[PDB]
């Protein structure tokens, strides 16, 4: 059902538009970068302890040291990447601060499509498409697509609008 | 016809080549490039059996 | 018109990311 | 090549180079006009190769004259129009009257104009009909439709031209006759929002007579 | 070992019983193989040969007398390598470039094994010649090819024509021309127009489609191959049924050939990441930092800051 | 001394700034000719014919298209799965019209990732590191390797491959959910399990560790400047952390050990992603999704309806819309 | 040193003669054993054969390579009049006169005997001065000089000069082997050599050499 | 066209063999080591 949520937000409302949406991913997939980013590094630039090779098993959790090289882990990100991160306080704050972003900035565009004010269709590549016909742009094959959507899966999604389509009506395409 | 052009797609030959002129810069850049590699051996590490690794 | 506004703009952020890459604070020792 | 050299080929060998889209190369047959017989034949593989395609570009530069214009090809090697028959009479003193029904008589191509302007346009000879006598067999053919009646607009909505002929080489025993060939025949329009251009084909052309 | 495995190979295909050819006219049989074709110059083109669409790599081989020629000369080379290995010790520019431990022999095989795998996943996706298609099954472009073939032979015997049928934008319908100036079936079999299959080369001619052989020349078995293989496409689903996803319930269907390629594409990416792995894993060991850095000697507080 | 040994004493030095190495040097041109063939297609394109139906398609910023719209359209159906550089091509107005610069941005930008994670090997072996952030970078390699090589591969055209835009994103993702059904499969929610719990788990360490940070500056300043770079000394409580998590859950989903903690880290959303990465792959070679059409039947025979059976209905109101001047025949799109 | 000594590598490996021949034991290069016949017992009749074989080895290296490389060029992309060395020498008398690399805008030779003549003069100076010892470089040693001739200078230390030597005669003995091939393959079948590689390796079982096996009959 | 095809497998083929004869040249010891 949450499936069928999320193809009701692409065919009717058009939810990919919507930059708080844009937002929103950046901060989900970027949170889910930073993750792997810190843990392929951290038990990577690894201190040495134990004796076999086996390095879960030389760690005591009761410790006044370190257990993975901060300046070695710079070097490495700064060499590679460029900008790289010098400071393990800011670092776990800015993980602490991206995927809530990504969240908040996704929920201002929740409230902003309940109260229908959509990321639907623009001004000038409509108007310029109307008048020029070979213009066919992704966007004016997104809205064409749309269309297709919302006069398609309606009649069975909604039956207390009481509407049956004559199969002329719906858009068919030319026999694909 | 009316243009010109190498027609090359769905041909097979080996490693893409038409003329022979375009075969000789191959061969032209590889033994330059081992040449320098083989005047550059001088200075490395040849041994009988010091060898590198476990 | 506006076409120069977006090149500017995606311009402007390279233009940022090179300044963060080279002319960065040193991250210094002890 | 020619035909039975084009036809020695197999299609692993053709296939990827270019031959296939080309009218066989017809050997000496100059002015053998007095060697031609009477005969209600037929055209085994009337081909025909374009060579340039211009186009009569409207702008003005100069004055009220417009010429025609060199232009580059788009697509890929997608023209040649092959395998074309029909009846093909010759008469008494070289009167041609070829008749053309069947085969792949259309192919769809655009073309730009220096400027940054492209244009689309059929290369269509349907159903040609060509009565003269061996300099300019003249007559009409068809440009049907530029597109289909069930084309999709992009948002879910909705003649005759000239052609001359010519011959140069004739075989004697064989019946393959060369020749040169001009058209000229309009552009397409998107039913009537853009006006039309008018284009001019130059080629050569094969045929084998049966 | 492998070189008699492959004269195992080249001795059942030359002398004992013989290998099903899938080209040999009128319809698929068993033959035996007299003249395999061994010739330096064209057996050592498929391995050069460039990867993509037309030209193919080592999956675009058409000929049992070439695979088996190509076998003499792996039967032939790998003898010749063993007795090379046996006798001969490696050479210092080769004792110097590899790290000589117990893991790193695993890591290179791992690499290897993976391009294996994906060799043999773009092999029985895409080959008709060693994985006929009476056995196994159609292919992705010979489903495309087939249902193009079968609305044609439908449409050639009611009245319409199969050249002038012009089609909704102008294009051919059913007949239009390749990049390359051949001719050849239209609608989206123009991204599959490099098939080449035993019932549709004799229709086939020197620029293509010869339209006086389908005006002519049609095979009852070619209509029956064809009728079969648009109703036994590729077209999968995880719970086994078959066609399209927006399909009923009707057939129970998945074609092998998706099995084999999507099971060997995994399992041979897995091989890879296998060996990303090892091979780092197997030079960290031999180095001496396998089990991380050490606290007094550390290799990054010797060195100048960046700045 | 020698030419040689001078050019690979600078070449794998540790000094220079950005590193280079031995995978660098097809890392730097390659990446830097797909850049640069970038950014000008991303501006002054002429349309493509992405179809083959002789239909151009913008996707410039001078035509008429924002960010948003813009993008680098693929190479034609025509063209098929041929290498088309542009030697091939007949002129320049030529080789942009047949989708050319597709063509060699992803054939250049699959070579110069693949060689940047050999780099991020090759760093980590000069330092004297251990060796396996490549292996966790093999995650969105094979990611960017699926839909830009494998899929095109499988169907058989570089057509459908994605769209190097923005707005092209999606048009290639919602087609591919008519075609496919990508989320009625299992791989697929694996990986939204992935992306899901990546973003949890990093919100949830970044919180318990900035929750027990050592008081060691005032409450004016700012409360980064307690960890002077390189030190030795531990800033966050782990214990007083580990503590808190125990309390707040479970003592015996505990992960006590920081190793045993980032290796979960390091562990989930690679494995998130790489079942994805198999899951294109598969749904390339047309092995579909899922398939509830019809389940639920009645006692006498008729066909009741799910949320299956109205995900049915959305996908034939793409697929009778998807590329729609080109199919004739009734199906293999 | 491997290469020579008393333990160098004998031209029959277990099997040759359990011994070196008594009048020679390594201190030159190149030295395997192979004097069967035993021609140069005396000293100084060896050492006219080693000033000879030199001679002849980096004669023959100039005549492989002056062999081999026309018949790459002409098949290749470029024009030459016959490129095979049979007919190289028949170039003068054909259409104008010698062009070389097929191009008659550089030397387009003619006069047959004035080539000759200026090879004569020439050819004498050159091999006046290996002799005794002229200009750029005096007479010192009549194999392996070393001197401004010489300009890379590789020869300074003795060990890689000694193994550099037993190189150069290595490839020596190699050319003059290759090029009685080419002599006997120039009289058998006629061809170009590189055109007997290309029907060797179109069919290796029967273009062999055997198909030519009864060409000489009585 | 052609001349931009030279040059194409020029640029190519030097760093190619720019990279084989980079790590025939004694990789794995130049690293910190023991
Ligand atoms: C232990 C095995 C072993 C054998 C059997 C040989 C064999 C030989 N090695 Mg030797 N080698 C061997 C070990 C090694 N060799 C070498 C390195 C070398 C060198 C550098 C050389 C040799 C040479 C020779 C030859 C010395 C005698 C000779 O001149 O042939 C004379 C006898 C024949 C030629 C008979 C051949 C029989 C054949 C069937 C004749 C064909 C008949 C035709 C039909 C006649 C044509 C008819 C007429 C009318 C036209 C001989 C062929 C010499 C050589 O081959 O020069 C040409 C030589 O220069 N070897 C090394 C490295 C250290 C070895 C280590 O194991
Ligand atoms: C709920 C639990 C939560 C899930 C936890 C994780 C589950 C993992 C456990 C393993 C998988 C589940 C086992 C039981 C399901 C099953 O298997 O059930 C499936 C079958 C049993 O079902 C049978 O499956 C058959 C499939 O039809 C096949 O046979 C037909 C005619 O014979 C047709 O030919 C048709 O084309 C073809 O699809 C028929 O439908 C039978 O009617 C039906 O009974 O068992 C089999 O096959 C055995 C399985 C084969 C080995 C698997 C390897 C196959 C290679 C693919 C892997 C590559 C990597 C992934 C890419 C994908
Ligand atoms: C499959 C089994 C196998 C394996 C594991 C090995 C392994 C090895 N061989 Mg080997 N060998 C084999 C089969 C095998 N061989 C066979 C069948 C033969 C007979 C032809 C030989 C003949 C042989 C010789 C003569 C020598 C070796 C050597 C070596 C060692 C170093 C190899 C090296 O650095 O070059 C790796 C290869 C290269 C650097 C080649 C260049 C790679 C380019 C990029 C590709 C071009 C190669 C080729 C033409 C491919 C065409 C392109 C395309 C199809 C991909 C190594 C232990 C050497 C050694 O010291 O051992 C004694 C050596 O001198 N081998
Ligand atoms: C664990 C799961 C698994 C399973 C179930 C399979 C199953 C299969 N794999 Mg496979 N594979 C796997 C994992 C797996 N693989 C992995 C992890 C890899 C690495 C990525 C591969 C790599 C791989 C390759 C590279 C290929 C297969 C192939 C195959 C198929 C045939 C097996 C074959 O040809 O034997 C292989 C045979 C041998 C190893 C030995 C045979 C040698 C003998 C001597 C030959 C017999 C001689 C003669 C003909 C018989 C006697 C005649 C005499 C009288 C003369 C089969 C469906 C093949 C296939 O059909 O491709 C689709 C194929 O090409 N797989
Ligand atoms: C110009 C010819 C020539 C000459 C003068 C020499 C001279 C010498 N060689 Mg030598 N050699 C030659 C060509 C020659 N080489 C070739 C082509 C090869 C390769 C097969 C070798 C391989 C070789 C080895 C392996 C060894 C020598 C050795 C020697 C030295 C002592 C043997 C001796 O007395 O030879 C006297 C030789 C002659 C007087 C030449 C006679 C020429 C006439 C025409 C008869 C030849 C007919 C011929 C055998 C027919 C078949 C030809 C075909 C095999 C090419 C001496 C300095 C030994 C040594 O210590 O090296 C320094 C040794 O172990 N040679
Ligand atoms: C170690 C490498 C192991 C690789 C394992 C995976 C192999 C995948 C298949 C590779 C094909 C190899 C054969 C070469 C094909 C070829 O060159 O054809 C030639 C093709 C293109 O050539 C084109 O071919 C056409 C023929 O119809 C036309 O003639 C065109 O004019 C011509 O340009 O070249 C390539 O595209 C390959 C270049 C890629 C080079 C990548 C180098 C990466 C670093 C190399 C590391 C050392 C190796
Ligand atoms: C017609 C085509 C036009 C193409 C134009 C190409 C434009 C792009 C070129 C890149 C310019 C920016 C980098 C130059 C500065 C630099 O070298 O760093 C300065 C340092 C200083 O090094 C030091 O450099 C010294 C030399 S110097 O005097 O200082 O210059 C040296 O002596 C010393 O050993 C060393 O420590 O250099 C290095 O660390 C390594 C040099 C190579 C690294 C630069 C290449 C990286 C480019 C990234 C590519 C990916 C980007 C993808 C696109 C977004
Ligand atoms: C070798 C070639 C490959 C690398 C080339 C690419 C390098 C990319 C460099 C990123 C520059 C961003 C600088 C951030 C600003 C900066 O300099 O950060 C600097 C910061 C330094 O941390 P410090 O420890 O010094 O901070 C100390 C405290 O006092 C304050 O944090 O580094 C980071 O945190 C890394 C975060 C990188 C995050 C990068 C994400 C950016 C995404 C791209 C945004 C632009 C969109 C592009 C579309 C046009
Ligand atoms: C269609 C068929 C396709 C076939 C493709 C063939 C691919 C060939 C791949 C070769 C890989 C070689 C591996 C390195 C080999 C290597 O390790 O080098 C090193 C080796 C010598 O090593 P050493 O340093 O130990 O030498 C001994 C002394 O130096 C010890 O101090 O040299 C060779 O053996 C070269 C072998 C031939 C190599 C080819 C000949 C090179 C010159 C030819 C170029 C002509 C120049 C013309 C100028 C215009
Ligand atoms: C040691 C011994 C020992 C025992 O005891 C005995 C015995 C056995 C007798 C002995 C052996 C011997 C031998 C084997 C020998 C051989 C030799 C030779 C063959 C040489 C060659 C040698 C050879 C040589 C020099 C060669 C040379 C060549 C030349 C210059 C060429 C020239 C030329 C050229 C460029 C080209 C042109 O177009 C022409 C010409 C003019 C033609
Ligand atoms: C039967 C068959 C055939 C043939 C086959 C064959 C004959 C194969 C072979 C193949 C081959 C013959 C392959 C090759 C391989 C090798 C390789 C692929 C190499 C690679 C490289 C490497 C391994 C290296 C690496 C590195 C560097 C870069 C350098 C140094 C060292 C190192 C390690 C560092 C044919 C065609 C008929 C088709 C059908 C099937
Ligand atoms: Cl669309
Ligand atoms: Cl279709
Ligand atoms: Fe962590």
Same mark, same amino acid.
């Given at each position: 059902?949450?499936?069928?949520?999320?193809?009701?937000?692409?065919?009717?409302?058009?939810?990919?538009?919507?930059?708080?949406?844009? $937002?929103?991913?950046?901060?989900?997939?970027?949170?889910?970068?930073?993750?792997?980013?810190?843990?392929?590094?951290?038990?990577?630039?690894?201190?040495?302890?134990?004796?076999?090779?086996?390095?879960?098993?030389?760690?005591?959790?009761?410790?006044?040291?370190?257990?993975?090289?901060?300046?070695?882990?710079?070097?490495?990100?700064?060499?590679?990447?460029?900008?790289?991160?010098?400071?393990?306080?800011?670092?776990?704050?800015?993980?602490?601060?991206?995927?809530?972003?990504?969240?908040? $900035?996704?929920?201002?565009?929740?409230?902003?499509?309940?109260?229908?004010?959509?990321?639907?269709?623009?001004?000038?590549?409509?108007?310029?498409?109307?008048?020029?016909?070979?213009?066919?742009?992704?966007?004016?094959?997104?809205?064409?697509?749309?269309?297709?959507?919302?006069?398609? $899966?309606?009649?069975?999604?909604?039956?207390?609008?009481?509407?049956?389509?004559?199969?002329?009506?719906?858009?068919?395409?030319?026999?694909? | 016809?009316?243009?010109?052009?190498?027609?090359?797609?769905?041909?097979?030959?080996?490693?893409?080549?038409?003329?022979?002129?375009?075969?000789?810069?191959?061969?032209?850049?590889?033994?330059?490039?081992?040449?320098?590699?083989?005047?550059?051996?001088?200075?490395?590490?040849?041994?009988?059996?010091?060898?590198?690794?476990? | 018109?506006?076409?120069?506004?977006?090149?500017?703009?995606?311009?402007?952020?390279?233009?940022?990311?090179?300044?963060?890459?080279?002319?960065?604070?040193?991250?210094?020792?002890? | 090549?020619?035909?039975?050299?084009?036809?020695?080929?197999?299609?692993?060998?053709?296939?990827?180079?270019?031959?296939?889209?080309?009218?066989?190369?017809?050997?000496?047959?100059?002015?053998?006009?007095?060697?031609?017989?009477?005969?209600?034949?037929?055209?085994?593989?009337?081909?025909?190769?374009?060579?340039?395609?211009?186009?009569?570009?409207?702008?003005?530069?100069?004055?009220?004259?417009?010429?025609?214009?060199?232009?580059?090809?788009?697509?890929?090697?997608?023209?040649?129009?092959?395998?074309?028959?029909?009846?093909?009479?010759?008469?008494?003193?070289?009167?041609?009257?070829?008749?053309?029904?069947?085969?792949?008589?259309?192919?769809?191509?655009?073309?730009?104009?220096?400027? #940054?302007?492209?244009?689309?346009?059929?290369?269509?000879?349907?159903?040609?009909?060509?009565?003269?006598?061996?300099?300019?067999?003249?007559?009409?053919?068809?440009?049907?439709?530029?597109?289909?009646?069930?084309?999709?607009?992009?948002?879910?909505?909705?003649?005759?031209?000239?052609?001359?002929?010519?011959?140069?080489?004739?075989?004697?025993?064989?019946?393959?006759?060369? #020749?040169?060939?001009?058209?000229?025949?309009?552009?397409?329009?998107?039913?009537?929002?853009?006006?039309?251009?008018?284009?001019?084909?130059?080629?050569?052309?094969?045929?084998?007579?049966? | 070992?492998?070189?008699?495995?492959?004269?195992?190979?080249?001795?059942?295909?030359?002398?004992?019983?013989?290998?099903?050819?899938?080209?040999?006219?009128?319809?698929?049989?068993?033959?035996?193989?007299?003249?395999?074709?061994?010739?330096?110059?064209?057996?050592?083109?498929?391995?050069?040969?460039?990867?993509?669409?037309?030209?193919?790599?080592?999956?675009?081989?058409?000929?049992?007398?070439?695979?088996?020629?190509?076998?003499?000369?792996?039967?032939?080379?790998?003898?010749?390598?063993?007795?090379?290995?046996?006798?001969?010790?490696?050479?210092?520019?080769?004792?110097?470039?590899?790290?000589?431990?117990?893991?790193?022999?695993?890591?290179?095989?791992?690499?290897?094994?993976?391009?294996?795998? =994906?060799?043999?996943?773009?092999?029985?996706? =895409?080959?008709?010649?060693?994985?006929?298609?009476? =056995?196994?099954?159609?292919?992705?472009?010979?489903?495309?090819?087939?249902?193009?073939?079968?609305?044609?032979?439908?449409?050639?015997?009611?009245?319409?024509?199969?050249?002038?049928?012009?089609?909704?934008?102008?294009?051919?319908?059913?007949?239009?021309?390749?990049?390359?100036?051949?001719?050849?079936?239209?609608?989206?079999?123009?991204? =599959?127009?490099?098939?080449?299959?035993?019932?549709?080369?004799?229709?086939?001619?020197?620029?293509?489609?010869?339209?006086?052989?389908?005006?002519?020349?049609?095979?009852?078995?070619?209509?029956?191959?064809?009728?079969?293989?648009?109703?036994?496409?590729?077209?999968?689903?995880?719970?086994?049924?078959?066609?399209?996803?927006?399909?009923?319930?009707?057939?129970?269907?998945?074609?092998?050939?998706?099995?084999?390629?999507?099971?060997?594409?995994?399992?041979?990416?897995?091989?890879?990441?296998?060996?990303?792995?090892?091979?780092?894993?197997?030079?960290?060991?031999?180095?001496?930092?396998?089990?991380?850095?050490?606290?007094?000697?550390?290799?990054?507080?010797?060195?100048?800051?960046?700045? | 001394?020698?030419?040689?040994?001078?050019?690979?004493?600078?070449?794998?030095?540790?000094?220079?700034?950005?590193?280079?190495?031995?995978?660098?040097?097809?890392?730097?041109?390659?990446?830097? /000719?797909? /850049?640069?063939?970038? %950014?000008?297609?991303?501006?002054?394109?002429?349309?493509?014919?992405?179809?083959?139906?002789?239909?151009? !398609?913008?996707?410039?910023?001078?035509? *008429?298209?924002?960010?948003?719209?813009?993008?680098?359209?693929?190479?034609?159906?025509?063209? *098929?799965?041929?290498?088309?550089?542009?030697?091939?091509?007949?002129?320049?107005?030529?080789?942009?019209?047949?989708?050319?610069?597709?063509?060699?941005?992803?054939?250049?930008?699959?070579?110069?990732?693949?060689?940047?994670?050999?780099?991020?090997?090759?760093?980590?072996?000069?330092?004297?590191?251990?060796?396996?952030?490549?292996?966790?970078?093999?995650?969105? !390699?094979?990611?960017?390797?699926?839909?830009?090589?494998?899929?095109?591969?499988?169907?058989?055209?570089?057509?459908?491959?994605?769209?190097?835009?923005?707005?092209?994103?999606?048009?290639?993702?919602?087609?591919?959910?008519?075609?496919?059904?990508?989320?009625?499969?299992?791989?697929?929610?694996?990986? !939204?399990?992935?992306?899901?719990?990546?973003?949890?788990?990093?919100?949830?360490?970044?919180?318990?560790?900035?929750?027990?940070?050592?008081?060691?500056?005032?409450?004016?300043?700012?409360?980064?400047?307690?960890?002077?770079?390189?030190?030795?000394?531990?800033?966050?409580?782990?214990?007083?952390?580990?503590?808190?998590?125990?309390?707040? %859950?479970?003592?015996?989903?505990?992960?006590?050990?920081?190793?045993?903690?980032?290796?979960?880290?390091?562990?989930?959303?690679?494995?998130?992603?790489?079942? /994805?990465?198999?899951?294109?792959?598969?749904?390339?070679?047309?092995?579909?999704?899922?398939?509830?059409?019809?389940?639920?039947?009645?006692?006498? *025979?008729? !066909?009741?309806? /799910?949320?299956?059976?109205?995900?049915?209905?959305?996908?034939?109101?793409?697929?009778?819309?998807?590329?729609?001047?080109?199919?004739?025949?009734?199906?293999?799109? | 040193?491997?290469?020579?000594?008393?333990?160098?590598?004998?031209?029959?490996?277990?099997?040759?003669?359990?011994?070196?021949?008594?009048?020679?034991?390594?201190?030159?290069?190149?030295?395997?054993?192979?004097?069967?016949?035993?021609?140069?017992?005396?000293?100084?009749?060896?050492?006219?054969?080693?000033?000879?074989?030199?001679?002849?080895?980096?004669?023959?290296?100039?005549?492989?390579?002056?062999?081999?490389?026309?018949?790459?060029?002409?098949?290749?992309?470029?024009?030459?009049?016959?490129?095979?060395?049979?007919?190289?020498?028949?170039?003068?008398?054909?259409?104008?006169?010698?062009?070389?690399?097929?191009?008659?805008?550089?030397?387009?030779?003619?006069?047959?005997?004035?080539?000759?003549?200026?090879?004569?003069?020439?050819?004498?100076?050159?091999?006046?001065?290996?002799?005794?010892?002229?200009?750029?470089?005096?007479?010192?040693?009549?194999?392996?000089?070393?001197?401004?001739?010489?300009?890379?200078?590789?020869?300074?230390?003795?060990?890689?000069?000694?193994?550099?030597?037993?190189?150069?005669?290595?490839?020596?003995?190699?050319?003059?082997?290759?090029?009685?091939?080419?002599?006997?393959?120039?009289?058998?079948?006629?061809?170009?050599?590189?055109?007997?590689?290309?029907?060797?390796?179109?069919?290796?079982?029967?273009?062999?050499?055997?198909?030519?096996?009864?060409?000489?009959?009585? | 066209?052609?001349?931009?095809?030279?040059?194409?497998?020029?640029?190519?083929?030097?760093?190619?063999?720019?990279?084989?004869?980079?790590?025939?040249?004694?990789?794995?010891?130049?690293?910190?080591?023991?």
């Amino acid at each position: 059902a949450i499936f069928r949520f999320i193809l009701f937000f692409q065919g009717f409302h058009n939810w990919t538009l919507n930059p708080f949406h844009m $937002m929103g991913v950046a901060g989900v997939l970027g949170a889910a970068l930073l993750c792997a980013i810190h843990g392929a590094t951290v038990e990577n630039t690894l201190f040495e302890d134990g004796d076999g090779a086996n390095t879960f098993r030389a760690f005591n959790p009761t410790q006044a040291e370190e257990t993975y090289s901060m300046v070695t882990a710079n070097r490495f990100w700064s060499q590679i990447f460029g900008v790289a991160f010098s400071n393990k306080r800011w670092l776990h704050f800015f993980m602490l601060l991206v995927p809530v972003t990504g969240l908040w $900035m996704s929920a201002i565009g929740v409230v902003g499509l309940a109260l229908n004010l959509r990321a639907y269709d623009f001004v000038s590549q409509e108007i310029r498409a109307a008048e020029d016909p070979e213009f066919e742009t992704f966007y004016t094959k997104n809205i064409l697509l749309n269309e297709g959507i919302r006069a398609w $899966m309606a009649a069975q999604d909604q039956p207390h609008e009481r509407l049956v389509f004559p199969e002329e009506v719906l858009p068919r395409g030319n026999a694909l | 016809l009316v243009d010109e052009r190498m027609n090359g797609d769905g041909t097979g030959r080996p490693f893409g080549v038409n003329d022979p002129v375009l075969g000789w810069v191959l061969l032209g850049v590889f033994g330059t490039m081992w040449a320098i590699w083989f005047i550059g051996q001088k200075d490395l590490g040849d041994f009988e059996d010091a060898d590198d690794g476990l | 018109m506006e076409a120069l506004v977006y090149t500017f703009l995606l311009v402007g952020t390279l233009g940022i990311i090179f300044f963060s890459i080279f002319f960065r604070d040193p991250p210094r020792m002890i | 090549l020619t035909f039975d050299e084009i036809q020695g080929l197999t299609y692993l060998q053709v296939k990827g180079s270019g031959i296939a889209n080309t009218c066989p190369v017809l050997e000496s047959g100059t002015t053998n006009l007095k060697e031609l017989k009477a005969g209600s034949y037929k055209l085994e593989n009337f081909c025909i190769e374009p060579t340039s395609f211009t186009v009569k570009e409207e702008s003005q530069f100069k004055g009220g004259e417009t010429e025609f214009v060199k232009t580059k090809l788009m697509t890929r090697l997608t023209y040649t129009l092959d395998a074309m028959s029909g009846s093909f009479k010759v008469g008494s003193d070289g009167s041609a009257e070829l008749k053309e029904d069947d085969g792949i008589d259309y192919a769809a191509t655009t073309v730009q104009l220096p400027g #940054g302007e492209r244009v689309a346009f059929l290369f269509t000879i349907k159903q040609f009909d060509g009565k003269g006598t061996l300099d300019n067999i003249k007559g009409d053919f068809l440009v049907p439709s530029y597109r289909g009646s069930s084309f999709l607009d992009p948002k879910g909505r909705g003649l005759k031209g000239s052609a001359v002929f010519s011959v140069a080489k004739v075989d004697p025993v064989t019946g393959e006759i060369a #020749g040169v060939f001009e058209s000229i025949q309009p552009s397409d329009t998107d039913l009537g929002a853009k006006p039309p251009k008018d284009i001019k084909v130059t080629g050569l052309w094969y045929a084998q007579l049966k | 070992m492998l070189g008699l495995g492959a004269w195992l190979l080249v001795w059942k295909a030359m002398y004992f019983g013989g290998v099903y050819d899938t080209w040999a006219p009128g319809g698929g049989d068993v033959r035996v193989i007299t003249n395999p074709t061994t010739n330096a110059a064209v057996i050592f083109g498929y391995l050069v040969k460039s990867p993509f669409g037309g030209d193919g790599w080592i999956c675009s081989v058409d000929n049992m007398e070439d695979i088996i020629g190509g076998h003499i000369w792996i039967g032939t080379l790998e003898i010749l390598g063993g007795i090379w290995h046996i006798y001969t010790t490696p050479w210092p520019w080769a004792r110097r470039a590899f790290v000589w431990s117990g893991e790193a022999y695993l890591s290179y095989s791992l690499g290897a094994i993976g391009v294996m795998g =994906f060799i043999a996943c773009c092999m029985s996706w =895409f080959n008709n010649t060693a994985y006929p298609s009476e =056995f196994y099954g159609p292919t992705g472009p010979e489903a495309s090819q087939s249902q193009a073939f079968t609305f044609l032979v439908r449409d050639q015997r009611l009245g319409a024509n199969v050249a002038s049928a012009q089609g909704p934008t102008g294009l051919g319908k059913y007949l239009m021309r390749s990049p390359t100036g051949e001719i050849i079936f239209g609608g989206e079999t123009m991204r =599959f127009w490099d098939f080449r299959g035993p019932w549709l080369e004799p229709l086939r001619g020197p620029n293509g489609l010869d339209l006086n052989k389908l005006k002519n020349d049609i095979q009852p078995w070619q209509e029956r191959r064809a009728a079969e293989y648009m109703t036994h496409a590729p077209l999968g689903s995880l719970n086994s049924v078959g066609g399209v996803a927006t399909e009923i319930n009707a057939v129970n269907f998945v074609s092998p050939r998706s099995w084999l390629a999507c099971s060997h594409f995994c399992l041979g990416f897995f091989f890879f990441i296998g060996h990303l792995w090892h091979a780092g894993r197997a030079r960290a060991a031999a180095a001496g930092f396998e089990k991380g850095i050490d606290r007094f000697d550390e290799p990054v507080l010797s060195m100048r800051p960046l700045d | 001394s020698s030419l040689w040994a001078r050019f690979c004493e600078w070449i794998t030095s540790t000094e220079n700034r950005l590193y280079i190495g031995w995978f660098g040097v097809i890392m730097i041109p390659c990446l830097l /000719t797909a /850049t640069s063939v970038f %950014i000008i297609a991303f501006i002054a394109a002429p349309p493509v014919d992405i179809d083959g139906i002789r239909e151009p !398609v913008s996707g410039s910023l001078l035509y *008429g298209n924002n960010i948003i719209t813009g993008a680098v359209i693929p190479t034609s159906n025509a063209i *098929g799965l041929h290498f088309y550089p542009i030697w091939e091509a007949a002129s320049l107005d030529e080789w942009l019209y047949n989708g050319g610069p597709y063509q060699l941005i992803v054939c250049h930008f699959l070579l110069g990732v693949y060689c940047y994670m050999g780099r991020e090997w090759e760093l980590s072996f000069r330092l004297g590191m251990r060796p396996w952030i490549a292996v966790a970078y093999s995650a969105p !390699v094979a990611a960017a390797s699926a839909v830009f090589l494998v899929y095109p591969i499988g169907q058989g055209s570089f057509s459908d491959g994605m769209p190097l835009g923005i707005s092209g994103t999606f048009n290639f993702m919602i087609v591919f959910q008519a075609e496919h059904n990508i989320l009625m499969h299992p791989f697929h929610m694996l990986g !939204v399990a992935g992306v899901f719990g990546g973003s949890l788990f990093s919100a949830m360490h970044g919180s318990l560790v900035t929750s027990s940070l050592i008081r060691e500056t005032t409450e004016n300043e700012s409360a980064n400047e307690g960890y002077r770079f390189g030190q030795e000394e531990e800033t966050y409580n782990i214990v007083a952390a580990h503590g808190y998590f125990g309390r707040l %859950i479970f003592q015996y989903a505990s992960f006590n050990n920081s190793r045993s903690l980032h290796f979960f880290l390091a562990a989930w959303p690679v494995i998130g992603i790489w079942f /994805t990465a198999l899951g294109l792959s598969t749904m390339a070679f047309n092995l579909n999704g899922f398939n509830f059409n019809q389940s639920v039947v009645d006692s006498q *025979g008729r !066909v009741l309806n /799910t949320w299956a059976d109205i995900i049915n209905r959305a996908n034939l109101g793409m697929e009778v819309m998807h590329e729609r001047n080109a199919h004739n025949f009734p199906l293999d799109l | 040193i491997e290469f020579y000594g008393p333990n160098r590598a004998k031209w029959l490996g277990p099997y040759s003669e359990n011994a070196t021949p008594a009048y020679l034991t390594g201190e030159f290069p190149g030295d395997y054993g192979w004097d069967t016949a035993g021609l140069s017992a005396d000293p100084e009749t060896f050492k006219r054969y080693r000033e000879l074989e030199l001679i002849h080895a980096r004669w023959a290296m100039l005549g492989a390579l002056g062999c081999i490389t026309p018949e790459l060029l002409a098949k290749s992309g470029t024009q030459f009049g016959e490129a095979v060395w049979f007919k190289a020498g028949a170039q003068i008398f054909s259409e104008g006169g010698l062009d070389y690399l097929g191009n008659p805008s550089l030397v387009h030779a003619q006069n047959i005997v004035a080539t000759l003549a200026v090879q004569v003069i020439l050819m004498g100076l050159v091999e006046g001065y290996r002799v005794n010892g002229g200009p750029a470089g005096e007479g010192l040693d009549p194999l392996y000089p070393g001197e401004s001739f010489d300009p890379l200078g590789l020869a300074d230390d003795p060990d890689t000069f000694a193994e550099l030597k037993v190189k150069e005669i290595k490839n020596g003995r190699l050319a003059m082997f290759s090029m009685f091939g080419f002599f006997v393959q120039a009289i058998v079948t006629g061809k170009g050599p590189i055109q007997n590689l290309d029907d060797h390796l179109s069919n290796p079982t029967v273009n062999n050499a055997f198909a030519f096996a009864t060409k000489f009959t009585p | 066209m052609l001349t931009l095809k030279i040059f194409v497998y020029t640029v190519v083929t030097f760093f190619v063999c720019l990279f084989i004869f980079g790590f025939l040249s004694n990789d794995p010891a130049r690293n910190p080591g023991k």
